[PDB]
Design a protein around this ligand. Structure first.
Ligand code: CL
Ligand code: CL
Ligand code: CL
Lengths: 146, 148
């Protein structure tokens, strides 16, 4: 199975099969799995919670809606001592989008710095152009609250 | 077979469910639910379009550690409500696991005590009864919250 990639402390990214290995996630301390898909089956691991963000890897779909509620869940899981695994089918677009959204919202990065952080961990990271624009709107809105 | 209705309102933007809420997609949409909290290892949730689902994987068993999941669970629920949505917490019987999560959330994010939070749950769902293990964990949670 492909490894999990540690994006940042208590933050992991993976492809779909990487979320199936119960032993990796236990090794990584993963307590919450964010499954950014509509069909991929998520963790079976005893005691690993799962949040499903149901989107196709598709510039039409509205991933912007789910960012703030998904990020709140993840930050809570980390502040309580756990860690998060964000996965999609390829570990390239949807999971990349949520990870950078998390880093902007809770680690106070700009979209550029945050995404450079995801890329360094995961070179193939590439949100489709629709998501990439939704993340700029997230940044816009974050700036205005901040 | 589980006690009806499928959905009960426990508090503004907070609904409890039994298994029969798995086929109540229309009632969900009425109630503007934007997040389902499935508190089971094995139960299915409603297939509500683009509604997020959080699974809190525990059996209705006094040895299951629900306490460990309350913070990300309660945090997801609040963020959905703060965003203007509603939450549906559902378990198979709508009695133990979903009740205890509803109690927890009220304590954590609406500052209610454990006497008042559970009262609201029981009052909306008269059969509600977390198993003794879940009740101990809830008691433990109220102490952690009164200290913090
Ligand atoms: Cl900044
Ligand atoms: Cl890019
Ligand atoms: Cl179950």
């Amino acid at each position: 199975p492909p490894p999990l990639v540690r994006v940042a402390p208590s933050l992991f990214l993976g492809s779909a099969r990487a979320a199936g290995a119960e032993e990796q996630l236990a090794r990584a301390g993963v307590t919450l799995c964010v499954n950014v898909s509509r069909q991929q089956p998520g963790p079976q691991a005893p005691g690993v919670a799962e949040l499903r963000v149901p989107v196709f890897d598709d510039p039409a779909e509205d991933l912007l809606a789910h960012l703030e509620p998904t990020c709140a869940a993840m930050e809570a899981a980390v502040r309580a001592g756990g860690a998060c695994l964000v996965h999609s089918k390829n570990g390239r677009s949807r999971s990349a989008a949520v990870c950078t959204a998390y880093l902007m919202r809770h680690r106070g990065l700009s979209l550029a710095k945050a995404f450079q952080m995801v890329k360094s961990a995961r070179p193939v990271a590439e949100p489709n152009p629709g998501f990439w624009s939704q993340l700029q709107k997230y940044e816009e809105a974050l700036q205005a609250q901040s």
